Amino acid sequence: TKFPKFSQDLAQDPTTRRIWYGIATAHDFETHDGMTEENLYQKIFASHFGHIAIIFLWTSGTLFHVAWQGNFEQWIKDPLNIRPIAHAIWDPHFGEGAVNAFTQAGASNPVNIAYSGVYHWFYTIGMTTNQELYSGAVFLLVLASLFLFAGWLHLQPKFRPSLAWFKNAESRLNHHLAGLFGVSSLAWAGHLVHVAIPEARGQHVGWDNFLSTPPHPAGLMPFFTGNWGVYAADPDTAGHIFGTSEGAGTAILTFLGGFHPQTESLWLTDIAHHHLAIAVIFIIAGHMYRTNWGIGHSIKEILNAHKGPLTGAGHTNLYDTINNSLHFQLGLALASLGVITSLVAQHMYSLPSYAFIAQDHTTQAALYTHHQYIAGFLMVGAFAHGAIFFVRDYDPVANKDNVLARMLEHKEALISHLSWVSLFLGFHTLGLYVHNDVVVAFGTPEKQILIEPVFAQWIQATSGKALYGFDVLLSNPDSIASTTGAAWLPGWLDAINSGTNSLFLTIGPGDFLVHHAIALGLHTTALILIKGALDARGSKLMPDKKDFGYSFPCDGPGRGGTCDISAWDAFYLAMFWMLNTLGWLTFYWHWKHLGVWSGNVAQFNENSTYLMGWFRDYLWANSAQLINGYNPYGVNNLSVWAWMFLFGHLVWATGFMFLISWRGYWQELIETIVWAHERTPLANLVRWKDKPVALSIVQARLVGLAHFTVGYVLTYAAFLIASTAGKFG
Amino acid sequence: FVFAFSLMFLFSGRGYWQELIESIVWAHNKLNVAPAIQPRALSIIQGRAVGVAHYLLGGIVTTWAFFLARSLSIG
Amino acid sequence: ELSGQPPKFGGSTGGLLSKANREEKYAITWTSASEQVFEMPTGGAAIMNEGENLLYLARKEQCLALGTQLRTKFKPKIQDYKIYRVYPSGEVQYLHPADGVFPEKVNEGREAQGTKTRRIGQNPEPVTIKFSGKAPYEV
Amino acid sequence: LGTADFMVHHIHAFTIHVTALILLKGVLYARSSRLVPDKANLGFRFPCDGPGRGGTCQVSGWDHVFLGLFWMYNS
Amino acid sequence: MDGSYAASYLPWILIPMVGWLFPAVTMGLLFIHIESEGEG
Amino acid sequence: DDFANLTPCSENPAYLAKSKNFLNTTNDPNSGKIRAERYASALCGPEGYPHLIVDGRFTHAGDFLIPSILFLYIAGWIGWVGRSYLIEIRESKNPEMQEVVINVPLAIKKMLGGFLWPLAAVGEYTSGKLVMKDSEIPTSPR
Amino acid sequence: PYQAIDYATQLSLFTHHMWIGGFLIVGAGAHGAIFMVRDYDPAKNVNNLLDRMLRHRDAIISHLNWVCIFLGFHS
Amino acid sequence: MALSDTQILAALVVALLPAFLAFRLSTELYK
Amino acid sequence: SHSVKIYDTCIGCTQCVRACPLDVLEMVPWDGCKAAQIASSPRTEDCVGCKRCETACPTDFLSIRVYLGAETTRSMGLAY
């Protein structure tokens, strides 16, 4: 059989497994038949072009559907009272009740309500009309076409890059720092000052008249004469109304700090100076490494020079290890991307940048949950692909006595102390929670163990939170740090001391307990991933694991039993802990913000100290409207979310039987079914081409994990959206 | 709780736990406090039995508490 | 070619399938010293007759399981069974025992196969053989 | 008894027949099967035969009991 | 199933192809390709 | 000025309102009054329940420091007696049998000698036989 | 006397003896397979009902699997 | 103001180009 | 088909050959051990990968190792 063309051993398989594994190893280019390094790199280049084109097409589709079936031009007239529309509904399976229920947001047909928060983003960046959205969609279509053609071209024989071109770290770093990061940020700052701010102040600026409309009145002379302060004079007053000329200043680069009084979001001019400054810094950074002139650093000598007397060989030979190994680079990139996605979530829920996005609680919750889940997935993938590197691309002799080898030396100490910290957190956190539960249940909630989060409150004070009376640093009015004449200090101190936003929310004993539980989850997931990565090469039970690859089922029932001794199994186990930690995180965030938005912070404050309050006040209480989306009486707009809630519960349940029941049972059952088919008249005329067999052990684990994760995500998303929409939306 | 706890044993295998016990045994050996009875991860059959036992216990206890509370609270 | 009266069996649903007439089947023959009851690997009990016997099974594992039962669970031990592979065209390939001596005991004239001149810990690192269609044990 | 009683009684029938199927497959196929033709010699309580034959996890009769316990709980 | 957006007749015809025609054609082509014996 | 959000329980209106109806934990009829008295000196939140402050300050040493010292002493006692009994039985002929069948005489002899566990531990560390060398411990392949 | 009006006692008794019955049935399904593995001897079972059961076991399991699928699907 | 039918049809026609380019890229990558 | 390798740490106890249910292994004369015999895998195309030979090996690490590879009808041990 032809398929799969990249693996002969799979193509000669006569069973249905050939269909499955061929899918699973399709995009693993290294293990393909007759694969060279150069071909691998070029194929990766083309595939990355493809993913970029897919991203651009997805964004174009978002824009086009919003412009076509949305209410963008009506939404901007009243962002605080109109639900944005995602896309239209066309379902012949609908009934009259569903049609009436889903005709919402002033539409004339069944429509969905957008929760990605793209309306606020488009409004903030200056898009105000449907035709602008349409032009953006068409331009993104053209851009995706260009990138697809670029992939095809650089895949052609005359345009195939050489191996040396791919292994040019210095030139890539210089171009991608100064150009990709710096020039793009500078262009965004120029877009903000030339277009976004004038449109926010009522002046319409487009391609038609942006050449005849200067950003600043006395423009482009002070920048070259050095009198930059002119661009900071006359900022937007506190009475400014977004999108109008009432109370609007003329400054284009400010450091006001805090939030816009009306939109409850960061000042646009602050964003302009911020992106300009980081563009300048990135452009400076991009002139660091030597490419083909005399000046510039070289990464290899920097790495080979930083060696100490305690670590042995230090960072020697690390340049070759990183450059020759693609999995090392992928793991580093995934770790960094996950960290900065977590950063995006944490600094975006507390410092909103888009106008009126702080008042749309549903979109805020959705965005936080989404980007935090993405960050968790990326953080898991970093460790997984690092373990893959250790299995495949790690050379012990080359990286001898350096830090990479030193990691595998005290790996037992690493795992032991990690196990100790995980157990130490878990025991004394579960003990405190159960103690509070038991004490509260016995009718004496006064004997609870409530620890004030003193250190985090001290940090809040050091940033300027004057509620705990710590009187330290920025909270100290006489401290040198608070008497530097910083232009952002008044606005920042005003915003931090206001209780109307999420900027440094007040904390208590429940936040202490839940943050320590999150710490337990993080350390346990790290323990699983790290032990898998370090034991991937081998352990006492399997000294020769590297010979068996990264993912293998087991080594049989002998020598104890094996049963998930591979590093792929470590990743598979760590996915569950990642999901559990993300669940705790999102539960804490959502309940705290429900209390904040309703003004009933005391409910969370006094009910989060014991687990029964979590079970009753959060889960039981907030499901009242969700599960009533469709009743024996009728149907409301939350019907789809109730259906998806049950759907997620069902898929989560279904994953359990790929996770618990194992292969031999189903193999024998399929044997019986095969007998039944072969012995049946009028069905013997039809025969299979691939012999039906049960799913393999690793495939079964993967499928169970997939159903599990899909159910988890769908259930929580449905519950969160339904609860927040019913409460506030 | 116990139901969820059972998912430790049903969803996992014993090689992971054996390697973890190897690391912990190294830890206890560094301090010369290693036990004479060498610790081992539970067998595959024992793991399945423990998982099913704790699972059934948790589920049945949940149903028992729910039923008794509801039936004593309905007069 | 292959001779022997089939053991008296009532027939079961666990026997051969289309693979026997499409891909191959297996045959086991042995000499019984008395007509006595033995256990079908496919389910059930059947009596084997005095003298030659011949049985068709679907897998080599089933034939070797029957051979193990014959060798272990009968006081007049049956050590003379022979297992052949029968192709749909008609070719019969002698499989077990290979040279007439059981593989458990060493017999001269055999050739070592799959034997490596090193120990398990001396296998080459994967990174030194990557991008070639080889595995550390294959080297 | 109405429509709901009809549905629930036939659901009961479905669950009971499935549990009976699991336990009957355990009892009948405990001696041997087309996959493993000598399970009787391996014993009644063994975890598997190995990763070969595509994977032979949970083939013993004890594993069939372990699987039937959950379905009894469900029913 | 009835909409007030511009060119409301498009989903009347586009969705079925994405619903039936495209999935069926893709099923057939992939099934033929993965099952085409030989030549690789 | 520390803990501006935490007030003394002796004046917090919520604590005083809720301390009248404190339940009796034991058969003693005035255990609730004793609990209210003992908790009136703590730092109550807006909901009237005592809060424990753990930052190192000695004014609130009773919250963490004293129980910490008590637990550390007891846990060190337990660990030291266990380790000493293990090392002692390791020189016998059936160390595993004495693991399941406890040598109660020797067990209690080690039980009663654990109150000086800090001095024994520091002498052990200085003698160098508290911690084994890395080259004398079995290790898994890297 | 006075048991029907005590709804809690009714529910508790029903559920308790229900669970006991389910567990005992599963135990039957287990110890029957134990007998088949250990105490079953083919010599004493020739063309008797046990052997005939062991002969059309594939048909039994296939038809039972089909009826389980049909019941679950339709209900 | 809301779009027109001609705009939607033109968007479809424009998107017909990246479809052809993506087909070419997929065929090239399969090779 | 799967691969079966025998390394020079074999002591010739013949347990692996006895444990093999599909007659894949054989005992050949040798000189490296006291028993002067080593295991071999001539009929490796019939191996299913049950790892019984690995379970039977008493050396500190298995002198016989099985590496699962391409899957055939025989390797899957199918009867249909």
Ligand code: CLA
């Ligand atoms: C990936 C982006 C994306 C997505 C998810 C959707 C989603 C949808 N569109 Mg849509 N659309 C998009 C981009 C997108 N659109 C773009 C860019 C255009 C301009 C050409 C349109 C033009 C369009 C029209 C004219 C109509 C829809 C309709 C619909 C709905 C019916 C389902 C469907 O797509 O089939 C029908 C729609 C198409 C087949 C449009 C072609 C798809 C685009 C052009 C290419 C996307 C390729 C994509 C990246 C492939 C990813 C591969 C990956 C899955 C592996 C659904 C909500 C219908 C609707 O409103 O029903 C209520 C409808 O009538 N779309």
Ligand code: CLA
């Ligand atoms: C019988 C049940 C049923 C069915 C058939 C549908 C069908 C539909 N609903 Mg719907 N709905 C239902 C019940 C149902 N609904 C219920 C009970 C509710 C709650 C009241 C809703 C609420 C609802 C809303 C709110 C919306 C719909 C929409 C839609 C349409 C989406 C178009 C589509 O699927 O293309 C897109 C197809 C896909 C995205 C495929 C995804 C599934 C596969 C498995 C993923 C692909 C995996 C893999 C890569 C496949 C490879 C390729 C393959 C060929 C091999 C479609 C007509 C939407 C609509 O009208 O917009 C057009 C919409 O907005 N429905």
Ligand code: CLA
């Ligand atoms: C100035 C020259 C230049 C530029 C612009 C690029 C640009 C790019 N190269 Mg590149 N490259 C260059 C020179 C350059 N290269 C040279 C000289 C070499 C040879 C040494 C290479 C060799 C090379 C290789 C080998 C590869 C690339 C690839 C890529 C693409 C990766 C996708 C990406 O990062 O974008 C997306 C990311 C960004 C735009 C910035 C990252 C986002 C930041 C970090 C955080 C987010 C900021 C902000 C908050 C997010 C916006 C929020 C908003 C949505 C609201 C990208 C388009 C890859 C590819 O295949 O692409 C086709 C690839 O594999 N390059």
Ligand code: CLA
């Ligand atoms: C830029 C990101 C990136 C890139 C380029 C790669 C690249 C690679 N990874 Mg990697 N990985 C990543 C992120 C990434 N990964 C992350 C974030 C994780 C953590 C989840 C992993 C976890 C991971 C593992 C555990 C493994 C790889 C492997 C691989 C290699 C090839 C196998 C493969 O993934 O194809 C095959 C991929 C698939 C078959 C994916 C199937 C899963 C589908 C998409 C789920 C679909 C869900 C379903 C449709 C939901 C429907 C919903 C509906 C009902 C509504 C390849 C080098 C494998 C390897 O070792 O190769 C060297 C391997 O074992 N990766």
Ligand code: CLA
């Ligand atoms: C609610 C369920 C639950 C619980 C409590 C645990 C608990 C634990 N898991 Mg775990 N796990 C679970 C579900 C759970 N897991 C699931 C579903 C998976 C996916 C398969 C995993 C996967 C997993 C992996 C992969 C790993 C863990 C690890 C751990 C340990 C880390 C230490 C810790 O968190 O606190 C400390 C422990 C606790 C607080 C639990 C003790 C709770 C009891 C009540 C204490 C008292 C015992 C009691 C007196 C006994 C009386 C019994 C008697 C009545 C018969 C711990 C034992 C890691 C580990 O071993 O770390 C060393 C590890 O490597 N688990």
Ligand code: CLA
């Ligand atoms: C009349 C009742 C009865 C009798 C006499 C037997 C007799 C026997 N059974 Mg059997 N069995 C029964 C009912 C019975 N069984 C039922 C109802 C089931 C279904 C659950 C089983 C399932 C079963 C299996 C699966 C196995 C046996 C085995 C055995 C043999 C002894 C080994 C054994 O289980 O002891 C050892 C017993 C234990 C270790 C039980 C201790 C652990 C239990 C489960 C904990 C219970 C906890 C409790 C409910 C709540 C505590 C809460 C906690 C917080 C305090 C023996 C022939 C074994 C065998 O093969 O023998 C040939 C075997 O493998 N039985």
Ligand SMILES: CC1=C(/C=C/C(C)=C/C=C/C(C)=C\C=C\C=C(C)\C=C\C=C(C)\C=C\C2=C[C@H](C)[C@H](O)CC2(C)C)C(C)(C)C[C@@H](O)C1
């Ligand atoms: C001797 C002994 C053993 C062994 C002991 C060993 C080997 C110990 C080894 C320890 C090592 C290697 C390292 C230890 C590190 C300890 C640290 C880092 C302590 C930190 C303390 C802090 C940060 C105090 C913090 C604040 C201190 C303050 C008083 C308040 O609260 C507030 C608060 C909590 C912030 C056993 C285990 C074998 C048996 C025992 O019985 C005895």
Ligand code: SF4
């Ligand atoms: S994973 Fe399955 S086949 Fe492998 S040892 Fe465990 S039970 Fe046996």
Ligand code: SF4
């Ligand atoms: S894995 Fe099984 S079939 Fe293969 S050689 Fe070893 S014992 Fe024989």
Ligand code: SF4
């Ligand atoms: S079991 Fe191991 S030591 Fe014994 S003969 Fe086989 S390979 Fe050699």
